[PDB]
Symmetry: D2
Subunit: 352 residues, 4 copies
Amino acid sequence: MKGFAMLSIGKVGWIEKEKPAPGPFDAIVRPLAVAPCTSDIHTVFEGAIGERHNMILGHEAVGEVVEVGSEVKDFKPGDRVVVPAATPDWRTSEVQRGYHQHSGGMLAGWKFSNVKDGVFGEFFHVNDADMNLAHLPKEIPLEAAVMIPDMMTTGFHGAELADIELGATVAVLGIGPVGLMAVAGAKLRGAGRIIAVGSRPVCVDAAKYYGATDIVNYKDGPIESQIMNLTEGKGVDAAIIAGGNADIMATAVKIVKPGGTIANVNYFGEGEVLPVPRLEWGCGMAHKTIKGGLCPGGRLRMERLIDLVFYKRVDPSKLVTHVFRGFDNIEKAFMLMKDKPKDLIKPVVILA
Amino acid sequence: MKGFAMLSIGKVGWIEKEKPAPGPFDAIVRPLAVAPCTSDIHTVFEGAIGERHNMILGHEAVGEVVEVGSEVKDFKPGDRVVVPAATPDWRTSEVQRGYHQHSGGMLAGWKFSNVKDGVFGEFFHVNDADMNLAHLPKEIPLEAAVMIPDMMTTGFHGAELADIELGATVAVLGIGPVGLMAVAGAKLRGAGRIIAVGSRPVCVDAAKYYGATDIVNYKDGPIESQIMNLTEGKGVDAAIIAGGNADIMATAVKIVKPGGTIANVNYFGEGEVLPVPRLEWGCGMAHKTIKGGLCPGGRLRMERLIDLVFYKRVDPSKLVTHVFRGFDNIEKAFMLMKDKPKDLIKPVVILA
Amino acid sequence: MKGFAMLSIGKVGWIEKEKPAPGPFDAIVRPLAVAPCTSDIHTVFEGAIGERHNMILGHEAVGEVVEVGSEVKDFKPGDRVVVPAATPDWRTSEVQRGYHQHSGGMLAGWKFSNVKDGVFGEFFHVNDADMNLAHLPKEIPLEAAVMIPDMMTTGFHGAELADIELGATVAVLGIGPVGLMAVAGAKLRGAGRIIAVGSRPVCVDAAKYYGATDIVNYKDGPIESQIMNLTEGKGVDAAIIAGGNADIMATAVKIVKPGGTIANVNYFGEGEVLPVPRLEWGCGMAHKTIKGGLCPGGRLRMERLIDLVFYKRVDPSKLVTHVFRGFDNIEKAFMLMKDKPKDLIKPVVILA
Amino acid sequence: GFAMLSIGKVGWIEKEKPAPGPFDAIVRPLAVAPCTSDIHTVFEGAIGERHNMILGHEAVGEVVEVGSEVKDFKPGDRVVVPAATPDWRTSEVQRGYHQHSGGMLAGWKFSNVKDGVFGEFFHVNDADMNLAHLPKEIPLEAAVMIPDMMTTGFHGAELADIELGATVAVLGIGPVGLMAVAGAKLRGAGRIIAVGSRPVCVDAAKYYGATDIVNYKDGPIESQIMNLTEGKGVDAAIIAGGNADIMATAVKIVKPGGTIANVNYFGEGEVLPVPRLEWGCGMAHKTIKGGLCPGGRLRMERLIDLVFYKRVDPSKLVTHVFRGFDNIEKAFMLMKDKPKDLIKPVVILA
Ligand SMILES: NC(=O)c1ccc[n+]([C@@H]2O[C@H](COP(=O)([O-])OP(=O)(O)OC[C@H]3O[C@@H](n4cnc5c(N)ncnc54)[C@H](OP(=O)(O)O)[C@@H]3O)[C@@H](O)[C@H]2O)c1
Ligand SMILES: NC(=O)c1ccc[n+]([C@@H]2O[C@H](COP(=O)([O-])OP(=O)(O)OC[C@H]3O[C@@H](n4cnc5c(N)ncnc54)[C@H](OP(=O)(O)O)[C@@H]3O)[C@@H](O)[C@H]2O)c1
Ligand SMILES: NC(=O)c1ccc[n+]([C@@H]2O[C@H](COP(=O)([O-])OP(=O)(O)OC[C@H]3O[C@@H](n4cnc5c(N)ncnc54)[C@H](OP(=O)(O)O)[C@@H]3O)[C@@H](O)[C@H]2O)c1
Ligand SMILES: NC(=O)c1ccc[n+]([C@@H]2O[C@H](COP(=O)([O-])OP(=O)(O)OC[C@H]3O[C@@H](n4cnc5c(N)ncnc54)[C@H](OP(=O)(O)O)[C@@H]3O)[C@@H](O)[C@H]2O)c1
Ligand SMILES: C[C@H]1CCC[C@H](O)C1
Ligand SMILES: C[C@H]1CCC[C@H](O)C1
Ligand SMILES: C[C@H]1CCC[C@H](O)C1
Ligand SMILES: [Cl-]
Ligand SMILES: [Cl-]
Ligand SMILES: [K+]
Ligand SMILES: [K+]
Ligand SMILES: [K+]
Ligand SMILES: [K+]
Ligand SMILES: [K+]
Ligand SMILES: [K+]
Ligand SMILES: [K+]
Ligand SMILES: [K+]
Ligand SMILES: [Zn+2]
Ligand SMILES: [Zn+2]
Ligand SMILES: [Zn+2]
Ligand SMILES: [Zn+2]
């Protein structure tokens, strides 16, 4: 089997791997639709996770099960499934603590394109199929379903961490695909006013579609000053960080009111320290909670997000601005995430 | 002044009262729109809370401030306000515990038509105006605004108590006005599948409008078997009780899965005991949490729900099936709530 | 292999079974100390879980690993271990929801003396050793360690469910071994006043040792009136049910103040319905939360309770009023559990 | 009244007895205690410039006069006065954050926006909401630890979200940290690792439940704790002292999914550092909380029950007891010089 892989830092290319074999609890999946992510770019060209050699990229996929182990019971060859980006080992002490995202170590729940070959191949390996796969209903299109493995679960997690009360005012810092799902997530938690911060017009339109009531362009002035004018000095009840540099952490604390919550799902890939402003954090005593979490994975997380799409609570197809067909177009879609045109949100490659 | 009052258990009529006088922190409001509730029916004709004498009924009103105390700071005569059904004293020990609904004793946060003259009069008294009143934006119609004081905050409270996770399956037992707002609340908490139980078609249509994906009519068979068939034996993650007799508590426990939650906002006016089925409650060990709460009130609760209506997260005007004009039609609206025609959800009397 | 077994409903005795074989993830353990439970009595003489034939009884044991499967990684033959009473399958959807006690179905986390042979034999089988075993420190005596598998985790779970705030007043209804650990748990959650309800003097003395500040004997009058007099009408912030018939549920609701919590760990083995008093539950609106849960199990739960004993946070050896030596005295300890002398709390059998 | 004359200058002034509102009460102090906050206010300008402001915010006094609407307190009652006496009729109270009632940290009024307790009398706003009766069985030197030290340290333990048997590290074993050590024990902590150096504080930490002592004499705190937990880290870290860098140490020693609970007051620097890598680059589920201590009547009543029913003995914090109004100055000066055998000084006035 072939696979679009990271040869080394700054280099990508196709490689031939021996098709993987499933353990007694594992499954082999061929992809029906894949999507590249900004994480793949940070991994290859910035060394976000360190040095990697000959590692197939990609972690957002929808596929068909072709082979299962002798102990796999809920999945058989021919089943269309949604594969979460996080496929942890479910038999660790961190799972018994309630944090499967860190099963076996910090962020160790994320295996694809990290500690194992990713989904950008003719086949890929899923560990613990009965715990890390969810059946895909036929009524959900592939381009919509491939938004569930990473974009939907991450953005919604930012809304979960934000501890949104009914009618609260929420700010979403960054309206990329994750941020757009955070806006939709904030709406799904009963937020009243949703202030979205971003500039790209294609993102602003998608943000309004998902529930944003105000748009703050960080080109029209400082984010902090704009939001304080919108909220008439009250600030926001919660801020969801879905993009930006390390400085955006300071912006979030400044706009959240005392007792509120700063929920980060953004990946800070550079800098030794994330700044927390001393005065705006009450010198340590303002009850401004700061959370930061990896997206949940596993079967149950996927099944619940599938129900949200199935019952028309959120339509993630607005994230898909580019659709390609064919295994070869994985490279072009990946290079699109590196160039990042102003009309791109998320590209999807459809496979035979 | 005039006011539709409870003469005794089973008797209602107009009575003559002394126009109320405000304390230094209080406000006098004349009603602009009022709505009767089922609670008044349980109070008068079932003796659910005991004997009352010449107590003006009603607790759902949008009004105009006509007089304020010397220490009221945020409200002046002429301000259109939304008056929460629950107007507690905010300087008690129960408020410091986080349960203002029971400020001064069980259910003591609910004063109108309970321990104080209600809103069905030419004027009524609001205690602690700066803490128990919210300004009404011009953009919200009166017939919609009067759904906020009680119907919206109660139904949404059922959804809050239910501890709904994103994509969870929620059953709403009873789709009267409170149940319909519980359906809307469940959607606002990110519920996927929402199973609504009721029979009246006007309620069924409203349930579908507010987010119900399935309708269970308790005329077509036992509720438990229908819901267990719908969920393929899994049960529901949460059940919100918004109507029915004491037996509906047993129905809720039977359909909620182990680890789920039964959230009751229904007001049981008859029976000595609410039944909890032993076996289906795991003989005490199934982790099926049972909650039951009076609706939140106060200025902040009203302001947050106003933002939900203002930013078009929920449209409560669909609850209003009958609109009348005039003090005389308060009697007609109250009696409609006693007979409950098959086409009634919520009546509103406009006093423009 | 010898084993004390439930022959049928109402009959027990020693039988010879084929020594069990471990699966690749399992372990074979020989017991060093065991304890009978009230649950074993309900199973044999009341048919609580139905008819059983030649099922070895017992679920509280501390032992030595004698054999492990090829995939067990943290335990080798010779390791002294604490075996939790609940040894669930850790690869189910209920584990992903956070309720391992119901892994595979209601209460299905409890396997010993239910769906598999218990610990009252020369050897027993532990499923998923790396997830369901904890190492036993040498400094902890066997008679103390064998209180961890069930009594400590159940009683402490009652304290966890009660949502105890620092300085709150907690009542524990029933001071058997589980109730005594609920008293200790309430102290470990920062309870101020702890009112323990019981009659047997050996139980009263243990309750005082574990932190009880007041003793209510239900022979001196109704529990409700006694507790309301002690708290001067305030009631308690939480009530932990650790014993009694179904009527104790109504008693619990009557003494808890509005906004409090009723946390049940008791096993109700009789009655079709557990009564919840309508009026004292606020007619459904008193914010009196009712919880009821099976005890937590698994490796992490045992390791944490082991640390509580190791670092001298709780001494469970005071629960042990009878210690016998010898494999044969399992019969005497089990029968002692049925006769219930006034000086008995928990008996322990030491082996070899 | 012992007052802050200006930045760096203090002295006795004119006892202009305060007047109570209809809901307020005038209390004369029976026992007071100075805090590091009093020192930061005067000599570092922590809250800005003040003129003729009576200092002090930890006092157990007796109410001598009440307003016409005070119902639960009469002249002659011995009460515990919390350091935080917020206005209870604001929107932040309806959100559940009375410490910020009317603005960030606005729940703390004594020695901030009103004269403190180091005077012949002081003014307590909303007596029925900000006062608690003091049982006779509780000694004064023990009771005066409740208004600030006990409620702060216990708040650090509350914010930490401690599960039964969890491993908790307390960074800093001053009076607040010592109460955080006792608080973690009250929340069911198993192993409690205390970080500090002064011997009188180390002995108190073991008394309140600390199972390990990490001294910066044997190496960096991060390396020591990782060896103690054999690389597992701790489930929660309560920050009760140190510079801004202690925030980075806290993140490094807490395991993924744990909690950093800060009650420390950071008075210098523009930014508190959160280490990127050890915070999972933003995704390690290491929650960071930081809150002002709770106040009000209920908070005091709950902590009084803990002392009354002998759940915690705060008298071990009191290393020096003085008698007389004049020794308020000497006790205040101890907090500035900080002897190595001092934890908390108390001035008895009854
Ligand atoms: N926690 C998890 O499990 C998880 C999962 C997936 C991804 N992530 C990470 O979360 C982040 C989300 O990125 P993405 O997938 O949504 O694609 P993206 O296009 O890179 O998102 C960046 C968004 O933030 C905007 N932005 C840049 N700087 C900003 C600033 N100072 N303030 C406000 N907005 C700013 C960008 O607008 P402009 O075009 O003007 O720059 C854009 O709208 C990534 O870093 C990703 O690696 C985390
Ligand atoms: N917690 C609070 O603060 C608060 C506030 C306001 C009201 N309440 C109370 O909550 C309840 C809500 O009533 P409402 O105002 O929404 O008007 P409602 O029309 O009386 O609500 C009754 C609903 O329950 C249904 N019902 C009756 N018996 C049923 C059964 N065996 N099984 C299933 N459904 C059954 C009814 O079915 P049909 O469609 O056939 O009629 C209807 O859908 C009332 O008791 C009210 O007093 C509480
Ligand atoms: N949730 C779980 O996972 C779990 C685990 C283990 C056990 N359990 C069950 O929880 C219960 C705990 O029993 P145990 O192991 O602690 O032994 P136990 O000695 O049988 O406990 C009975 C206690 O409850 C008292 N009691 C009986 N009726 C009472 C009444 N009307 N009012 C007040 N107290 C009353 C008893 O009073 P006296 O002092 O007069 O006897 C005694 O103190 C058992 O039913 C057990 O099967 C549950
Ligand atoms: N959130 C609130 O409401 C509240 C209330 C009261 C006070 N506070 C503030 O919280 C802090 C608690 O201070 P305190 O009253 O308990 O007296 P303190 O003596 O100042 O407590 C400081 C503790 O931290 C130690 N320390 C200093 N640098 C350290 C470092 N790099 N690493 C580890 N430990 C270090 C100190 O050692 P030494 O023994 O050598 O000094 C001492 O043990 C103060 O800053 C206070 O202003 C907050
Ligand atoms: C950190 C990593 C988690 C899973 C997939 C995301 O894109 C990035
Ligand atoms: C009631 C029973 C359930 C599991 C734990 C022990 O076996 C007791
Ligand atoms: C900031 C200030 C709050 C109340 C009293 C404490 O000592 C410190
Ligand atoms: Cl496995
Ligand atoms: Cl006031
Ligand atoms: K907060
Ligand atoms: K489905
Ligand atoms: K539950
Ligand atoms: K508005
Ligand atoms: K409650
Ligand atoms: K140990
Ligand atoms: K956390
Ligand atoms: K007391
Ligand atoms: Zn991705
Ligand atoms: Zn009503
Ligand atoms: Zn047992
Ligand atoms: Zn202080």
